[PDB]
Amino acid sequence: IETVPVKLKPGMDGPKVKQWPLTEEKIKALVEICTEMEKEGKISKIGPENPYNTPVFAIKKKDSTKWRKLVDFRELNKRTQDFWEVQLGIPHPAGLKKKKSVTVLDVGDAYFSVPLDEDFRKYTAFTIPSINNETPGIRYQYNVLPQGWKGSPAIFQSSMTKILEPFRKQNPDIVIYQYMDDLYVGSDLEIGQHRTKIEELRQHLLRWGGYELHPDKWTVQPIVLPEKDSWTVNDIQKLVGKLNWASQIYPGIKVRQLCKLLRGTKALTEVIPLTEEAELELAENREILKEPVHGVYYDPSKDLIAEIQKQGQGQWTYQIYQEPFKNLKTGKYARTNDVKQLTEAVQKITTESIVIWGKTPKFKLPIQKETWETWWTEYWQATWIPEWEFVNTPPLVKLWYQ
């Protein structure tokens, strides 16, 4: 019943983010949902005295005709004080990322129970927009712990472990990790035996009031060289270029013998037999590439970056690093349309990041803000939102990944 006084970081003020235009459908959906949340005293209309705003969105649930309100507290969270989550502040189980199979649960609703510090409420302000600006826009602010704010899982943490210690004690063969509104449940049991233990938690959670990841089967898609019958000047050329680029990572890559096949302005299609001398160079470079560069360790105090490339035909590639070239992971994704796909990869990549390091990475998306801002909510399903940025991919990069 008492509220833990939360505060924004020093000097910081509340977010005044713009609200991207929403389709009629979406608004209606939000109008229904909020009207309800209001009746149940979760939220409340606000006066003009409140100048703050957070973007709100309506997304459809996977395998459900129901809509879910997604508030983009990205900025609010950003300017929200830290909480001592060092001492018994979870933190992150190295075991999970390998616990065979894992299911993700949305416990957001659990927050609706705890009331939110009144002095902080004003910052949760958000608006349900209106078409063609016919009317002011419905304004609200949360009274309870709001789903999506980084303060929620914290304040609830207490009561949360409380409600979980039993199941934990009961099934210590199960890893249970919480992230914002999500609950990552990992185990090695057999599928049928898994989905069951999950339901046991589904209901053990109801006692107080739908994914299917496979962490163990993830791998670092490395860089690869063409391996062909005959080698034309062009091949060599491209081959050398790629090699040249990769050398900045793996220093043991020599191209000497390969560049010597290029001496001379031959015709691009002229076939060049590989002089044994060179043939071994390839062999070597080829072997140096069989594994990630040595000494790439994750640093919790540094931002986790994510770059995706549109490989083509519904294929994409990404890399997660904190420091240029020093990739922590590298993978690919295969299927729709570009956007749907892109949003899927994004969500998938975030999930992994969470599961592995416990943080959402910062994506560099190869799209146009307007487009993304238009359809992302059309296929998005997660309850969190990574930070993104939009960029133009240099043709060569995409080449070096396949």
Partner 1 sequence: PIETVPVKLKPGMDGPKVKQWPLTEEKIKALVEICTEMEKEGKISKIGPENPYNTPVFAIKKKDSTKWRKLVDFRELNKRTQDFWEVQLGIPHPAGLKKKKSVTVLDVGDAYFSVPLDEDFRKYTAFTIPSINNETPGIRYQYNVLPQGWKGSPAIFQSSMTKILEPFRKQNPDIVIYQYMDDLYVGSDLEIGQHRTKIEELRQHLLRWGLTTPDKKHQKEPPFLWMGYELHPDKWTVQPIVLPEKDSWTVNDIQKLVGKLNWASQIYPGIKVRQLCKLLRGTKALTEVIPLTEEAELELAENREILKEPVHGVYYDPSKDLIAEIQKQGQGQWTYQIYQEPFKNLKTGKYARMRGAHTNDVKQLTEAVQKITTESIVIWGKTPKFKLPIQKETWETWWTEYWQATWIPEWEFVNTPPLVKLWYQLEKEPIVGAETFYVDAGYVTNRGRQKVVTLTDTTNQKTELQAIYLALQDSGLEVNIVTDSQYALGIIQAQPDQSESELVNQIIEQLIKKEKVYLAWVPAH
Binding site for partner 1 (CB under 8 A): 21-25, 27, 47-51, 53, 131-137, 139, 232, 234, 237-238, 240-241, 244, 265-270, 309-310, 312-313, 337-342, 366-368, 370-371, 374-375, 392-396, 398
Nearer to partner 1, 132 or 301 (CB): 132
Q: How far is the CB of 256 from partner 1 (least distance, A)?
A: 13
Q: How far is the CB of 37 from partner 1 (least distance, A)?
A: 19
Q: How far is the CB of 111 from partner 1 (least distance, A)?
A: 25
235 is annotated as contributing to ligand binding = no
What's the per-residue H, E or C state across the chain? CCCCCCCECCCCCCCECCCCCCCHHHHHHHHHHHHHHHHCCCEEECCCCCCCEECEEEEECCCCCCEEEEECCHHHHHCECCCCCCCCCCCCCCCHHHCEEEEEEECHHHHHHCECCHHHHHHHCEEECCHHHCCCCEEEEECECCCCCCHHHHHHHHHHHHHHHHHHHHCCCCEEEEECCEEEEEECCCHHHHHHHHHHHHHHHHCCCCCCECHHHCCCCCCCCCCCCCCEHHHHHHHHHHHHHHCCCCCCCCCHHHHCCCCCCCCCCCECCCCHHHHHHHHHHHHHCCCCCCCCCCCCCCCCEEEEEEEECCEEEEEEEEECCEEEEEEEEECCCHHHHHHHHHHHHHHHHHHHHCCCCEEEECCCHHHHHHHHHHHCCCCCCCEEEECCCCHHHHHHCC
Nearer to partner 1, 106 or 338 (CB): 338
List, in sequence order, every residue forming a beta bridge with 175; answer none if it has no partner.
Answer: 186
Q: How far is the CB of 27 from partner 1 (least distance, A)?
A: 7
Neighbours of 269 (CB within 10 A): 9
d(CA 36, CA 27): 14
Nearer to partner 1, 27 or 43 (CB): 27
Task: Give, to the nearest 10 degrees, the angle between helix 338-357 and helix 369-379.
Answer: 70
Nearer to partner 1, 61 or 369 (CB): 369
Q: Check if the beta carbon of residue 322 is closer than 8 Å to that of residue 298.
A: yes
Q: How far is the CB of 178 from partner 1 (least distance, A)?
A: 33
Q: How far is the CB of 177 from partner 1 (least distance, A)?
A: 32
106 is annotated as contributing to ligand binding = yes
Q: How far is the CB of 304 from partner 1 (least distance, A)?
A: 22
Q: How far is the CB of 243 from partner 1 (least distance, A)?
A: 9
138-142, strands of its sheet edge to edge: 43-45, 138-142, 126-128
Annotated binding site, which residues?
Answer: 106, 181-182
Annotated binding site for Mg(2+), which residues?
Answer: 106, 181-182
